[PDB]
Write a protein that binds this ligand. Structure first.
Ligand code: CD
Ligand code: CD
Ligand code: CD
Ligand code: CD
Length: 52
């Protein structure tokens, strides 16, 4: 299915040894997993997930 981030428009590279599984889904960062609680987007400075 191609390892993809739970975010609707996010597809950053996810690493198994640090995979953030939240509610059974994988995310690229702890930010996407928690729907960006600290208001912090993901490490990708060009990504627009949750922004748009
Ligand atoms: Cd993103
Ligand atoms: Cd990302
Ligand atoms: Cd993400
Ligand atoms: Cd996100």
């Amino acid at each position: 299915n191609e390892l993809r981030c739970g975010c609707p428009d996010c597809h950053c590279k996810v690493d198994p040894e640090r995979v953030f599984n939240h509610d059974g889904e994988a995310y690229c960062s702890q930010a996407c997993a928690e729907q960006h609680p600290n208001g912090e987007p993901c490490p990708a400075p060009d990504c627009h997930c949750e922004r748009s």
